[PDB]
Design a protein around this ligand. Sequence first.
Ligand SMILES: Nc1nc2c(ncn2[C@@H]2O[C@H](COP(=O)(O)OP(=O)(O)CP(=O)(O)O)[C@@H](O)[C@H]2O)c(=O)[nH]1
Ligand SMILES: [Mg+2]
Length: 660
Amino acid sequence: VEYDLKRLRNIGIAAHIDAGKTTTTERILYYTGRIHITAAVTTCFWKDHRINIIDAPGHVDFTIEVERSMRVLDGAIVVFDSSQGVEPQSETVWRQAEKYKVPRIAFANKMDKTGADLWLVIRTMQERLGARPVVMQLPIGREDTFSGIIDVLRMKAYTYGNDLGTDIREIPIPEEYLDQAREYHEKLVEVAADFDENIMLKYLEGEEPTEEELVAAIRKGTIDLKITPVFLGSALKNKGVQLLLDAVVDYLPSPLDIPPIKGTTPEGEVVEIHPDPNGPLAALAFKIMADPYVGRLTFIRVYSGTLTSGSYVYNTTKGRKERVARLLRMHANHREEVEELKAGDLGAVVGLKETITGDTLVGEDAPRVILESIEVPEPVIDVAIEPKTKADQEKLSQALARLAEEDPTFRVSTHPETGQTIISGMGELHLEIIVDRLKREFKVDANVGKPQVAYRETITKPVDVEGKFIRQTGGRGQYGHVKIKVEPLPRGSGFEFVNAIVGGVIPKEYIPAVQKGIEEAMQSGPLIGFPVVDIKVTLYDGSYHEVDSSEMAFKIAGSMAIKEAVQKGDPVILEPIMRVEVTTPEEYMGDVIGDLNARRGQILGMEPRGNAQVIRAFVPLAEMFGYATDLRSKTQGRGSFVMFFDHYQEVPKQVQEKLI
Ligand SMILES: Nc1nc2c(ncn2[C@@H]2O[C@H](COP(=O)(O)OP(=O)(O)CP(=O)(O)O)[C@@H](O)[C@H]2O)c(=O)[nH]1
Ligand SMILES: [Mg+2]
């Protein structure tokens, strides 16, 4: 175990679509892999430092896998496409880094492409992002003549012979560039002066400081979220990627340099878990992969203590033992088996049958802390799915079971009378990618209906009703007779059944049958056909025919009673109420407030984050369809939002008629 905590670097590459996120990653692994695919975490070496490239989801609108991966990584490279400029959503990726207090460096990719303006990037970081950038390098040559890069801090430059990254020469700075470099070098020192008194008192005195001095201060400013170093080049034309690697080991934080992850005890106490390898074990799980030839892989981040291969861990979320079989590190083109993962590092475990993405793993004798929050988010959006021709069906109902493992947060059901296949999840985007991950990945071709909000039904007042089923059906006679007392149950409390049968008035056998009929009618309410919730059912009386009584009779009899009940109890539709934090440029505040209220929303409060304003608001899910458009239409593309389920609500009286 050649593990040093200080010389460890956990990175994530964040970028707007088309910036060079994948290309840069590809090149990064290549240059590091020259001594003697994807996958959640990938490891490599540069200048005696371990770099763990935490794989961006990506696609930034799934704000569950983002918050999770932001806690896993420590520093980020934010990649900009310097061709088009800085487009709308490029802001969104920046706001995320701000949200999770993660130190960052910028990388202006595509200095080779026509339209490559370095400065358009720098200025838009100052203005829109509010990033206070510090210029670390300057280009040599324009677009297609882009052939060198100057490092202004050390005052040296690099010419590139080809575009394959196989000829790199350290040259003295061209005369045509020496003045501009000197300007920006002086500028750089000035920035360092804000973070070192020693640098300050030298910068006043006229004396040029040492590299160790500047590097240390410019690094201090980065980890403290005050400045953002900017680097450039062409990832495609293999220019400046090695210098980007150097920047990673220089200015980006090690696990020692950041604020300690906060977890919760089983009592609700808030603890700061310290990154000590000798202390108790606490580790997060964040990706469950299916691997062709090892089995299930579950990717972990270790925060304190040591995860040792071939041992046991305690799963605070599920409350059970788990056997850690083997441990692995993922490299560019091979797998490495390891004996232990210590505090601050990352890899993937083998085995771990019962663990799901988002769970915590402690060291058996260790404090029973939880890293994430407890509750399970509800299924709120329904989508109908119809398989083409038999062959796709049998491998669709197979495709879903063979996928309800890495993501158990989606539910599958069958619609009461249409007999289709209904899939439900956490929102639109959650489901719209599951559909795609079936036609391409699992190769199932079928038709998909337009997303629809999952409503619920319930009574407002207590009633007392009876259901009978006396008919001559299929040669024989049928008799079932039940008398129930139903009342409303506090919100979120669900179902409750009570038996209060006195004198074998309804014989022992037929009691399960009555329950089964109740449930089935509780699937399809008498307002819109959505499931009935939050009620207490009480079976107190009834009757039976000595010979005509049957399970089927008391099933239908129980069904007829509960439909009659939910009808008489002054029913009411329930809609999900979402919780929305909306990040917006300070200026366009009024025009977003004066829109959430038009969505029947209620404002909770606005507090600044960075140079922008985040708004917290309660809005119904039904008034959230295609918000990503309306938002970017009223913020010139600069706005962005997140969404979480909070509770269920009794719908306003005007909305009810519109739904019935
Ligand atoms: N001219 C030029 N083109 C580049 C450079 N780096 C990447 N590209 C090109 O731009 C495109 C961006 O794709 P990619 O590298 O996957 O970016 P990405 O952000 O991963 C796209 P997504 O976010 O959808 O996965 C690619 O087609 C790539 O060939 C560069 O340095 N210069
Ligand atoms: Mg990609």
